Structures are given as structure tokens and as C-alpha cells.
């Protein structure tokens, strides 16, 4: 019963429908999110941000916790899946999930090879929330409630440089995004 997330046309976001996730800040704020990879790791793919505000990235689909509601709502746990158009380079999934702690950077990265559905301790890392970010748009928040007895990180997601690219990770300063209906 939370308020819906809205796309840039003011329409409520629909579970299962394709949206570009584009920085709410253009220019120096970059473009959209996309499937990427690291220099030293082909699979799984990582979540990266396009540098150019002309480039909206890879479309995503959102999957609700309750398969019955078709509206994506604020502050409710969701799965997020990139829907690439290109060939599938990897056998891992394109579903977002939080990585294990990266000792080389001090970051908890957003990566892929997540899982869709089965809300449980087994899938805890695959559940994200979308929340209002000022009047600019929305932010992603990782704070899953799908396992009331599980200890979990509970943090906004920001953007940070890594490996010559722009990635997403848990952090104190959220990066704001908007959702655009895919083509």
C-alpha cells in the first residue's frame, strides 16, 4: 500500500515492463545504467553507469515480492534484472545483487548473478528498495526485509569509480535516478 514509483511521464511503474534507469542529473551526472564487466573478470557482469547523458544504458525489468501486484511501489523489496539486447556472454544471471565485501576497495558492490523471487535468507542479497530522492527522482536502497531474523546491511546506493568505470555500491550519499519507458 505504499505510494507507487513513477516514470518520467508521471505514470506508475509496472512490474515486468522495461525501463531505462537514467541518472536524474545529466551532464556531469552521467547517463543510464548498463551491463558491464571488469578488466580481470568476464563473468558475472557488473552494473555500470554510462558516462554520457545521451546513453540510457541497458533496460531493466522489476519483479515485485508479491507476484500479484503489478505496480512497483516505493520502499518495498524488489528484484532488478537487466534485459540486454546483445548476445549473452555469460552463464550467470543479469539480476542485480550485492556482492561480498571487496577488501581491495572497502566497497560492497552491486553486481549481477542475483536471483528472481523466492524471498528467503538464500536470496537476501537480491532484494532492493526504491525510495524518493529529494525532488530529483529516486534512489536505490539495499535493506531487505524478506528475512526478519537475518542480520543485513541497510544502506543507500551511490556511484563510485572503479577499474576506470562508474559502478554502484552501498554508501552514505545516494545517487538519484529516474525511470524512462524503454523505447
Amino acid at each position: 500500500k505504499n505510494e507507487p514509483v513513477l516514470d518520467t511521464d508521471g505514470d506508475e511503474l509496472r512490474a515486468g515492463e522495461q525501463y531505462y534507469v537514467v541518472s536524474a542529473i545529466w551532464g556531469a551526472g552521467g547517463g543510464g545504467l548498463a551491463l558491464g564487466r571488469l578488466t580481470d573478470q568476464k563473468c558475472p557482469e557488473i552494473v555500470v553507469q554510462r558516462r554520457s547523458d545521451l546513453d540510457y544504458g541497458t533496460p531493466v525489468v522489476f519483479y515485485n515480492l508479491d507476484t500479484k501486484d503489478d505496480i512497483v511501489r516505493r520502499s518495498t523489496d524488489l528484484n532488478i534484472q537487466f534485459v540486454p539486447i546483445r548476445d549473452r556472454l555469460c552463464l550467470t544471471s543479469t539480476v542485480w545483487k550485492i556482492d561480498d565485501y571487496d577488501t581491495s576497495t572497502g566497497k560492497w558492490w552491486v553486481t549481477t548473478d542475483g536471483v528472481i523471487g523466492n524471498p528467503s535468507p538464500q536470496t537476501l542479497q537480491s532484494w532492493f528498495k526504491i525510495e524518493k530522492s529529494g525532488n530529483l527522482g529516486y534512489k536505490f536502497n539495499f535493506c531487505p526485509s524478506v528475512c526478519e531474523s537475518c542480520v543485513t546491511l541497510c544502506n543507500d546506493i551511490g556511484r563510485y569509480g572503479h577499474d576506470g568505470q562508474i559502478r554502484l555500491a552501498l554508501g552514505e550519499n545516494a545517487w538519484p535516478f529516474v525511470f524512462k519507458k524503454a523505447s
Binding site: 518520467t8 511521464d9 536524474a24 542529473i25 545529466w26 551532464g27 556531469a28 551526472g29 552521467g30 558516462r51 554520457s52 547523458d53 545521451l54 529529494g134 525532488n135 530529483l136 527522482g137 551511490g158 556511484r159 563510485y160 569509480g161 562508474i166 550519499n173 538519484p176 529516474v178
Partner: protein, 223 residues
Amino acid sequence: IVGGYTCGANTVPYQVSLNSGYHFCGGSLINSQWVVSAAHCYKSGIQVRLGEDNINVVEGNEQFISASKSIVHPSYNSNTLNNDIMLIKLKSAASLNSRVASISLPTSCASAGTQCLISGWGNTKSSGTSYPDVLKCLKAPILSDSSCKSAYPGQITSNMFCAGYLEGGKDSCQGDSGGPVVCSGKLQGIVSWGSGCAQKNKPGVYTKVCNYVSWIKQTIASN
């Protein structure tokens, strides 16, 4: 540029396009061999295009010069968007003429209310996207620090200024990044960032060039 007009034929001869097989950012010619743009526009292998008619079509009258170096401001930070300025040295000097000319650097900062000329090949639509084939121009006033800081709480630095109309309808947009903001014949601003295109209370944000004239001159002297 949203809510603007097609620029007069020779009226913005300091406008350049940064190119990697396609236009991705604007810039400003400051001398025959140097271009000012945004740090966030950096990429290796930049070709700079000057004197352009249709940016979607190679033609005569246009000069294509490879960037020989691209010097991002050393304090440029992707999280704070601060210090969003970059200098590009051209491999060969450019030929100045009626369609290619430099723009003067400022000697003092401009005050709120000053009218300025903002130009670029960016999006022209407040809803959706439309990229023009011709250079678009917009006259807009610099906004007060308070109006800028209230529109973008906690995000406006001493190296940034807002310009445009809080009512919306007229603004810089995606694709205009790196472009010029000229007030009384001085390059006072570089298109840096914004949120949405020509929306109420979300004006464009520009790098405050007057803060960087010393770094620019010292950079050019040592390169």
C-alpha cells in the same frame, strides 16, 4: 537547448563540438590551439570539430583537428560534480575566420541577473528527446546563489552557478554539456549539469569559469 532559437550563421564561431565519430559534448575555442570544455566530457581520442553546419553531416568549411592532450582539472570529483572543467590542446592550430574564432576569458566574475548566451546541439524537448542538426542558442540570466542552492539543496559549490528560468521552458539539456555560456563577450560558464530538461525550479548548472582563469593560463603556459 530547450526553448531557444537556431543561432545566426556566424554568431557563435567559438562553439566547437567534441567528437569520437559522433558529437558527444560541446566546447569553446579560447585560443587558436586550445578549447575549454567540461571535465566530465573527457575521453581519449577526441576529435574537435569547428565551424560546423550540420553536425550530422561532414562538409566543407569545417576543420577537424585531433586533440593532442586533454587536461582534466585535477580536483574534479565525480561525486560532488565540482571543478567540472577541462582543457583540450589541438594537435595543429586552427584557422580563424568568419566561422571559427576564439572567445575571451573573463577578468571578473559575472553577477546574478546578467544575461548570457548559451549554445549547443543538445536536446530541444522538455519531454522526450530531439537532437537538432543545427546549433541552437538561448539567452538566459544568471540566477542568485540562493535560488540556485534552494533548487539543488547541498549540491551547489563556489565553482558552480545556475542560469535560466525557474518557471521552466528554457534551459540547457543532454548534449549541451561542455558548451559555452558567454556574458558580455566573456566565457563565464560551461554547461556542467542539470536535472530534467527545462522543468520548473530545475535550472541548468554551469562551471564558474572566472574561478579557473589562473589555472587555465598556467596550464596553457606549461603545455
